[PDB]
Amino acid sequence: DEAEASKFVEEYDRTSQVVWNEYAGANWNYNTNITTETSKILLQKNMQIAQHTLKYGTQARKFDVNQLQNTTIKRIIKKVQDLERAALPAQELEEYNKILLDMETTYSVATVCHPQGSCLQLEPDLTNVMATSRKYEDLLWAWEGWRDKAGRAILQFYPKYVELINQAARLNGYVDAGDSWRSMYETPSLEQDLERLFQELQPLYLNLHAYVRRALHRHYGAQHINLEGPIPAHLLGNMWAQTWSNIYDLVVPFPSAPSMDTTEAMLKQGWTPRRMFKEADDFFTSLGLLPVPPEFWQKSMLEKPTDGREVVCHASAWDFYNGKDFRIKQCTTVNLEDLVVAHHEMGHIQYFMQYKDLPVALREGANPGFHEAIGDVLALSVSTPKHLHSLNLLSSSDEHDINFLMKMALDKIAFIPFSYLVDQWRWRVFDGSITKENYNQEWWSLRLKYQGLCPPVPRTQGDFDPGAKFHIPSSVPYIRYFVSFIIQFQFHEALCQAAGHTGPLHKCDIYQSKEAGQRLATAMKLGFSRPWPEAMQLITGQPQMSASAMLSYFKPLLDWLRTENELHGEKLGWP
Ligand SMILES: *[C@@H]1O[C@H](CO[C@@H]2O[C@@H](C)[C@@H](O)[C@@H](O)[C@@H]2O)[C@@H](O[C@@H]2O[C@H](CO)[C@@H](O[C@@H]3O[C@H](CO)[C@@H](O)[C@H](O[C@H]4O[C@H](CO)[C@@H](O)[C@H](O)[C@@H]4O)[C@@H]3O)[C@H](O)[C@H]2NC(C)=O)[C@H](O)[C@H]1NC(C)=O
Ligand SMILES: O=C(O)[C@@H]1C[C@@H](C2CCCCC2)CN1C(=O)CP(=O)(O)CCCCc1ccccc1
Ligand SMILES: *[C@@H]1O[C@H](CO)[C@@H](O)[C@H](O)[C@H]1NC(C)=O
Ligand SMILES: [Cl-]
Ligand SMILES: [Cl-]
Ligand SMILES: [Zn+2]
């Protein structure tokens, strides 16, 4: 019994490395060169990997996991018993794969055209418009156009996608696809735990929302901002209003402190996409963590091709399951926002390298939120005025202090409600609570309820605004990013204490701390081999998710915001 199970996992591991490596190659080749040919190859490799999953998953299910003694083997076999989409009958699997390909392609090639003019792609063009334009009608054209062309075009696929991903989930023992996604956390109390974390961030978010709302009132006019209502969703500097720091110029707490134009500084100093990833690589090795291999620099796609290729620009980090080949695919722009994204992606890469010697079934983060958080942790230190000054991107007070926390909060605090609601919506689609009759109406009920946002143009039949957000057509879970924003502050607090930092948490910069790197390395090397509380305990000395670190980080800003909003008589929220 035990020996057959040991031999099975050994055979599964050596055969999976080969099949997954070939699939990743074809998937990469399509993502970096969308053509009829690369798609057909990709759909073909999808059947090869499905055949492999079906063979070994079927055998995995013949083992009584209850009777297995070794806990590691037990854990691998139980995981291999989930065939995912390979549980579907051949017809449904082919349909599902084609639906996923059509949805992701549709999103990644959509364009928005000026009337009788040029057509803009999401990256860099529409992203830049949302970030820099300060004109209501210009932002409205981009915001509505992107949903008309990306969102509406996904709607025809989504009901069948839901049917098929749910059918696969049920064939693997779950009640629907959202049940299966939540199980990735191995936490029966996940929904309650996440809800309590969200509620703990309400004071900060409501106060930030009211303050930003007041500033938008000042710039966009009293006829267009209701000081007791939700904020129009196109005015926050980002296509999904998920992060707000691109409107920092409109909301500066102390404008007497002049802001240095960081984008012009990077450009003026010759920064390139390569330089940005090199700086991130240097931060990782400064902690004693691993450098990316030479292969990474030869094979990655660090900027948008200029040779006619159509590509998937949305940033992602790729493990090719051979322990040597790791790559980033990002249409990088030279600015601070994408430097932070670059660090985010390099954290994925770091995780891949740290757990590369585990069995492939355990080459995942402790939970998906851990995988999303690593790069963000370092980026917190990178974003400090001290570190940015050392990169010659800033010029060397309480005013500057509150200014910096506001910049951070526009990204870290504003993202909390957005990242919470995406899968609140999808979980209820998957469990049948939301039908295609009210996809979009229920999306905006959550946009209002959690983010306090409203659409600038009333939605109509045919709209499918969730389809205008990458992770929806690409079928990538989102609660991981909510978890990441909570725990990345817990990790920051812990590493800063390990590094000997005293004083306000937001002044910590862990650059070159070997003590901090070692905490992270010991956790990352566990991969998915243990329940995630153990990785949490290795980093922080305790096992729970907690918002206390994030609240401690932003405490000075919470006090400043309350005083400011009180002074102006704001009514928090949106009744
Ligand atoms: C339950 O099973 C797991 C997994 O076993 C592994 O997979 C099976 C399918 C089968 O192939 C097994 O043969 C195979 O080991 C066990 O977990 C493994 O435990 C061993 C314990 O030694 C670990 O071995 C380590 O491997 C490292 C990389 O090669 C190596 O560096 C380590 O050396 C360290 O210690 C020596 C001591 O002399 C020191 O000299 C070194 O400098 C270094 O510190 C060590 O040899 C495996 O990595 C583990 N693999 C996994 C996946 O966890 C587990 O022990 C078992 N449980 C029970 C109760 O039997
Ligand atoms: O864009 C978003 O919405 C979120 C939030 C953003 C984060 C970055 C730093 C600053 C704060 C926000 C990062 N991100 C991403 O999707 C980037 P990924 O690599 O996780 C996207 C991964 C998609 C799945 C995948 C995996 C491997 C290969 C191909 C596809
Ligand atoms: C893109 O794919 C086509 C067809 O597979 C191929 O001929 C072409 O060389 C590829 N381009 C690049 C830059 O790899
Ligand atoms: Cl939207
Ligand atoms: Cl997740
Ligand atoms: Zn990520």
Author numbering: 40 to 435, 439 to 617
Sentences from the paper on this structure:
The functions of sACE are widespread, with its involvement in blood pressure regulation most extensively studied. sACE is composed of an N‐domain (nACE) and a C‐domain (cACE), both catalytically active but have significant structural differences, resulting in different substrate specificities.
Here, we report kinetic data and high‐resolution crystal structures of both nACE (1.75 Å) and cACE (1.85 Å) in complex with fosinoprilat, a clinically used inhibitor. Particularly, altered hydrophobic interactions were observed to be a contributing factor.
